[PDB]
Design a protein around this motif. Structure first.
Motif, PDB file in Angstrom:
ATOM      1  N   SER B  32      35.584  49.536  38.926  1.00 18.58           N
ATOM      2  CA  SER B  32      35.394  50.443  40.138  1.00 18.58           C
ATOM      3  C   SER B  32      36.157  50.419  41.321  1.00 18.58           C
ATOM      4  N   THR B  33      36.959  49.141  41.186  1.00 18.38           N
ATOM      5  CA  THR B  33      37.738  48.698  42.230  1.00 18.38           C
ATOM      6  C   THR B  33      38.923  49.908  42.844  1.00 18.38           C
ATOM      7  N   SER B  34      39.510  50.703  41.690  1.00 17.74           N
ATOM      8  CA  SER B  34      40.261  51.717  42.036  1.00 17.74           C
ATOM      9  C   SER B  34      39.704  52.944  42.626  1.00 17.74           C
ATOM     10  N   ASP B  39      35.149  44.446  44.175  1.00 19.06           N
ATOM     11  CA  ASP B  39      34.707  43.663  43.222  1.00 19.06           C
ATOM     12  C   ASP B  39      33.932  42.656  44.226  1.00 19.06           C
ATOM     13  N   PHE B  40      33.266  41.562  43.405  1.00 17.87           N
ATOM     14  CA  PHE B  40      32.531  40.744  44.243  1.00 17.87           C
ATOM     15  C   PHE B  40      32.992  39.258  44.540  1.00 17.87           C
ATOM     16  N   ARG B  41      33.814  38.572  43.250  1.00 13.74           N
ATOM     17  CA  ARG B  41      34.377  37.316  43.320  1.00 13.74           C
ATOM     18  C   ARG B  41      35.682  37.093  43.347  1.00 13.74           C
ATOM     19  N   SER B  42      36.926  38.149  43.417  1.00 16.07           N
ATOM     20  CA  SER B  42      38.320  37.549  43.538  1.00 16.07           C
ATOM     21  C   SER B  42      38.610  37.135  44.828  1.00 16.07           C
ATOM     22  N   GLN B 111      27.116  46.314  34.658  1.00 18.98           N
ATOM     23  CA  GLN B 111      26.730  45.569  35.729  1.00 18.98           C
ATOM     24  C   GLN B 111      26.715  46.170  37.335  1.00 18.98           C
ATOM     25  N   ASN B 112      27.288  47.501  37.045  1.00 21.27           N
ATOM     26  CA  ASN B 112      27.747  48.050  38.380  1.00 21.27           C
ATOM     27  C   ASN B 112      26.310  49.134  38.701  1.00 21.27           C
ATOM     28  N   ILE B 113      26.387  49.110  40.047  1.00 20.16           N
ATOM     29  CA  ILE B 113      25.239  49.695  40.446  1.00 20.16           C
ATOM     30  C   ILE B 113      25.563  51.304  41.109  1.00 20.16           C
ATOM     31  N   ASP B 114      27.071  51.625  40.902  1.00 26.17           N
ATOM     32  CA  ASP B 114      27.724  52.743  41.426  1.00 26.17           C
ATOM     33  C   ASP B 114      27.278  54.091  40.758  1.00 26.17           C
ATOM     34  N   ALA B 176      15.855  49.631  43.143  1.00 25.62           N
ATOM     35  CA  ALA B 176      15.758  48.982  41.999  1.00 25.62           C
ATOM     36  C   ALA B 176      16.840  48.271  41.374  1.00 25.62           C
ATOM     37  N   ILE B 177      17.581  47.601  42.207  1.00 25.35           N
ATOM     38  CA  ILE B 177      18.856  46.873  41.876  1.00 25.35           C
ATOM     39  C   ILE B 177      18.398  45.530  41.571  1.00 25.35           C
ATOM     40  N   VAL B 178      18.899  44.777  40.399  1.00 28.27           N
ATOM     41  CA  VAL B 178      18.279  43.467  39.987  1.00 28.27           C
ATOM     42  C   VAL B 178      18.799  42.342  41.023  1.00 28.27           C
ATOM     43  N   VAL B 214      35.503  44.424  29.865  1.00 28.08           N
ATOM     44  CA  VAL B 214      36.432  44.722  30.837  1.00 28.08           C
ATOM     45  C   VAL B 214      35.782  44.661  32.269  1.00 28.08           C
ATOM     46  N   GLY B 215      36.695  44.120  33.135  1.00 26.28           N
ATOM     47  CA  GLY B 215      36.529  43.773  34.496  1.00 26.28           C
ATOM     48  C   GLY B 215      35.304  43.274  35.035  1.00 26.28           C
ATOM     49  N   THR B 216      35.024  41.914  34.581  1.00 27.74           N
ATOM     50  CA  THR B 216      33.797  41.154  34.921  1.00 27.74           C
ATOM     51  C   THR B 216      34.189  39.958  34.825  1.00 27.74           C
ATOM     52  N   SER B 217      33.786  38.775  35.652  1.00 27.19           N
ATOM     53  CA  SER B 217      34.113  37.710  35.617  1.00 27.19           C
ATOM     54  C   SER B 217      32.956  36.588  34.783  1.00 27.19           C
ATOM     55  N   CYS B 239      39.455  42.825  28.643  1.00 30.68           N
ATOM     56  CA  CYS B 239      40.804  43.358  29.484  1.00 30.68           C
ATOM     57  C   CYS B 239      40.014  42.874  30.744  1.00 30.68           C
ATOM     58  N   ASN B 240      40.806  42.041  31.452  1.00 29.90           N
ATOM     59  CA  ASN B 240      40.531  41.418  32.649  1.00 29.90           C
ATOM     60  C   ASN B 240      41.772  40.887  33.572  1.00 29.90           C
ATOM     61  N   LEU B 241      41.619  40.742  34.706  1.00 31.55           N
ATOM     62  CA  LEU B 241      42.878  40.172  35.425  1.00 31.55           C
ATOM     63  C   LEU B 241      42.958  38.735  35.139  1.00 31.55           C
ATOM     64  N   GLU B 242      41.897  37.971  34.751  1.00 31.85           N
ATOM     65  CA  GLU B 242      41.506  36.725  34.755  1.00 31.85           C
ATOM     66  C   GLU B 242      40.861  36.360  33.193  1.00 31.85           C
ATOM     67  N   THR B 243      41.442  35.338  32.586  1.00 33.09           N
ATOM     68  CA  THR B 243      40.609  35.025  31.272  1.00 33.09           C
ATOM     69  C   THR B 243      39.113  34.323  31.846  1.00 33.09           C
ATOM     70  N   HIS B 259      45.564  41.089  30.172  1.00 34.14           N
ATOM     71  CA  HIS B 259      45.528  40.902  31.587  1.00 34.14           C
ATOM     72  C   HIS B 259      46.153  42.191  32.123  1.00 34.14           C
ATOM     73  N   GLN B 260      45.408  43.036  32.537  1.00 31.99           N
ATOM     74  CA  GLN B 260      45.692  44.436  32.804  1.00 31.99           C
ATOM     75  C   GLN B 260      44.618  44.802  33.825  1.00 31.99           C
ATOM     76  N   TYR B 261      45.145  46.057  34.644  1.00 30.52           N
ATOM     77  CA  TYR B 261      43.940  46.648  35.511  1.00 30.52           C
ATOM     78  C   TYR B 261      43.278  47.515  34.454  1.00 30.52           C
ATOM     79  N   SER B 262      42.032  47.852  34.547  1.00 28.44           N
ATOM     80  CA  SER B 262      41.085  48.834  33.809  1.00 28.44           C
ATOM     81  C   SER B 262      41.767  50.219  33.748  1.00 28.44           C
ATOM     82  N   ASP B 263      42.304  50.900  34.587  1.00 23.88           N
ATOM     83  CA  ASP B 263      42.866  52.185  34.796  1.00 23.88           C
ATOM     84  C   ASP B 263      44.088  52.269  33.717  1.00 23.88           C
TER      85      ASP B 263
HETATM   86  C1  LIG Z   1      25.566  44.528  42.345  1.00 24.60           C
HETATM   87  C2  LIG Z   1      25.118  43.007  41.621  1.00 24.60           C
HETATM   88  O1  LIG Z   1      23.395  43.471  41.692  1.00 24.60           O
HETATM   89  O2  LIG Z   1      25.709  42.278  41.686  1.00 24.60           O
HETATM   90  C3  LIG Z   1      26.895  41.845  41.287  1.00 24.60           C
HETATM   91  C4  LIG Z   1      27.286  42.590  39.814  1.00 24.60           C
HETATM   92  O3  LIG Z   1      26.794  43.299  39.036  1.00 24.60           O
HETATM   93  C5  LIG Z   1      27.773  41.033  39.356  1.00 24.60           C
HETATM   94  C6  LIG Z   1      28.817  40.648  38.325  1.00 24.60           C
HETATM   95  O4  LIG Z   1      29.943  40.702  38.888  1.00 24.60           O
HETATM   96  P1  LIG Z   1      31.076  41.268  38.194  1.00 24.60           P
HETATM   97  O5  LIG Z   1      31.381  40.257  37.022  1.00 24.60           O
HETATM   98  O6  LIG Z   1      30.647  42.604  37.546  1.00 24.60           O
HETATM   99  O7  LIG Z   1      32.119  40.908  39.277  1.00 24.60           O
HETATM  100  P2  LIG Z   1      33.006  40.101  39.844  1.00 24.60           P
HETATM  101  O8  LIG Z   1      33.552  40.499  41.231  1.00 24.60           O
HETATM  102  O9  LIG Z   1      32.397  38.703  39.455  1.00 24.60           O
HETATM  103  O10 LIG Z   1      34.192  39.824  38.848  1.00 24.60           O
HETATM  104  C7  LIG Z   1      35.329  41.340  38.626  1.00 24.60           C
HETATM  105  C8  LIG Z   1      36.285  40.687  37.652  1.00 24.60           C
HETATM  106  O11 LIG Z   1      37.119  41.854  37.412  1.00 24.60           O
HETATM  107  C9  LIG Z   1      38.297  41.571  37.487  1.00 24.60           C
HETATM  108  N1  LIG Z   1      39.045  42.705  38.233  1.00 24.60           N
HETATM  109  C10 LIG Z   1      39.123  43.320  39.428  1.00 24.60           C
HETATM  110  N2  LIG Z   1      39.507  44.319  39.631  1.00 24.60           N
HETATM  111  C11 LIG Z   1      40.187  44.507  38.177  1.00 24.60           C
HETATM  112  C12 LIG Z   1      40.769  45.862  37.739  1.00 24.60           C
HETATM  113  N3  LIG Z   1      41.168  46.772  38.409  1.00 24.60           N
HETATM  114  N4  LIG Z   1      40.953  45.917  36.223  1.00 24.60           N
HETATM  115  C13 LIG Z   1      40.666  44.639  35.382  1.00 24.60           C
HETATM  116  N5  LIG Z   1      39.876  43.566  35.835  1.00 24.60           N
HETATM  117  C14 LIG Z   1      39.547  43.554  37.290  1.00 24.60           C
HETATM  118  C15 LIG Z   1      38.171  40.205  38.304  1.00 24.60           C
HETATM  119  O12 LIG Z   1      39.677  39.486  38.182  1.00 24.60           O
HETATM  120  C16 LIG Z   1      37.059  39.510  37.829  1.00 24.60           C
HETATM  121  O13 LIG Z   1      37.250  38.621  36.959  1.00 24.60           O
HETATM  122  O14 LIG Z   1      27.561  39.883  40.338  1.00 24.60           O
HETATM  123  C17 LIG Z   1      26.822  40.646  41.920  1.00 24.60           C
HETATM  124  O15 LIG Z   1      26.232  39.456  42.355  1.00 24.60           O
END
Ligand SMILES: CC(=O)O[C@@H]1[C@H](O)[C@@H](COP(=O)(O)OP(=O)(O)OC[C@H]2O[C@@H](n3cnc4c(N)ncnc43)[C@H](O)[C@@H]2O)O[C@@H]1O
Ligand SMILES: [Zn+2]
Lengths: 10, 285
Positions: B32-34, B39-42, B111-114, B176-178, B214-217, B239-243, B259-263
């Motif tokens: 959802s970054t695009s 995101d949360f941890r980059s 894991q998204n709340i959007d 109701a977000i966890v 896809v797109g989660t750390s 599919c993620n910018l980082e392993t 290693h590619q952007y989701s879109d």
């Molecule tokens: C909202 C909430 O209740 O909580 C959040 C959420 O659901 C949760 C889990 O974080 P989540 O793992 O989902 O977030 P993170 O922010 O931890 O990780 C996002 C991951 O996506 C990668 N990324 C970013 N943009 C990207 C793109 N365009 N294409 C591909 N990869 C991309 C990035 O490198 C990273 O490993 O932790 C938070 O605490």
């Protein structure tokens, strides 16, 4: 797995 | 270096040779970054890297149920910025819709709340919003359920004087977000139990199922346990910018990392599958 939402252990 | 086209081509090749096995997606903030949602941890750009002004004990505390109870202001403040409504689904979200239209989407664990998967047209039955959403509210004390309007109305206030409270036990009410410290909705494990059984049936019968992460750390549990729990006979794709997570910790021979952007990944996959005609109907629908 279940349990309370938590940041992974390091 | 080289284009990711060759790697995505193997995913298309897998689907073409194993057509009678639907696909499971496990996604995070990266998809959802695009859309304009960080995101949360980059490093540097992640939401948790831009919360210094809130002066929290630490970034994650903004979503911690114990901290929330001690002081709900930080969360109310941030909630104003991430409340759904003005964001539109990305090309990757429409890829999920495409898989659904072709009836090859087994499930999307998000894991998204959007709620952008739903906004893209993905059916409720195929979506598992593992971390909840703003659809409704609840008391952190007794669990009483409330409509979302109660909270949304408060968010529009400035300055806020009193926060929403339960009329049954008096504790604070929140979307109701966890939060850290809370259990995920029962539907999460119930559905994973079902899909896991389905995966075994498919491999124990042959065509190999595919799970695309896809797109989660993979830094948050229990969601991060999903990739680990995928049967060894099921092919995993990341599919993620980082392993990350189990793909880095316990790399499996059949794992495919891109290693590619989701879109861009979605566009390449549609191209390699040759489903441009049906994808077009979606982007213009
Ligand atoms: C909202 C909430 O209740 O909580 C959040 C959420 O659901 C949760 C889990 O974080 P989540 O793992 O989902 O977030 P993170 O922010 O931890 O990780 C996002 C991951 O996506 C990668 N990324 C970013 N943009 C990207 C793109 N365009 N294409 C591909 N990869 C991309 C990035 O490198 C990273 O490993 O932790 C938070 O605490
Ligand atoms: Zn209550």
């Amino acid at each position: 797995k279940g349990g309370a939402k938590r940041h992974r252990k390091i | 270096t080289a284009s990711t086209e060759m790697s995505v081509r193997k995913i298309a090749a897998h689907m073409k040779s194993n057509p009678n096995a639907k696909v499971i997606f496990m996604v995070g903030a990266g998809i959802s970054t695009s859309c304009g949602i960080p995101d949360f941890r980059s490093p540097g750009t992640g939401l948790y890297h831009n919360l210094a002004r809130l002066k929290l004990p630490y970034p994650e505390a903004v979503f911690d149920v114990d901290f929330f109870q001690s002081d709900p202001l930080p969360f109310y403040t941030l909630a104003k910025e991430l409340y759904p409504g003005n964001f539109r689904p990305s090309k990757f979200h429409y890829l999920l819709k495409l898989f659904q239209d072709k009836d090859v989407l087994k499930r999307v664990y998000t894991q998204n709340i959007d709620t952008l998967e739903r906004q893209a047209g993905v059916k409720d039955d195929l979506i598992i919003e593992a971390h909840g959403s703003f659809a409704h509210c609840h008391c952190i004390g007794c669990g009483k359920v409330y409509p979302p309007q109660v909270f949304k109305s408060k968010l529009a206030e400035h300055p806020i004087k009193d926060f929403v409270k339960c009329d049954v036990c008096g504790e604070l009410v929140k979307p109701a977000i966890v939060f850290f410290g809370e259990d995920l909705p029962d539907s999460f494990s119930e559905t994973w139990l079902n899909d896991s059984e389905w995966l075994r049936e498919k491999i124990t019968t042959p065509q190999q199922p595919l799970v695309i992460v896809v797109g989660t750390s993979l830094a948050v549990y229990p969601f991060a346990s999903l990739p680990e729990e995928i049967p060894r006979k099921v092919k995993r794709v990341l599919c993620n910018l980082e392993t990350v997570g189990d793909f880095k910790a316990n790399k499996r021979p059949t794992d495919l990392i891109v290693h590619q952007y989701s879109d861009e990944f979605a566009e390449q996959l549609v191209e390699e599958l040759g489903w441009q005609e049906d994808f077009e109907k979606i982007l213009t629908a």
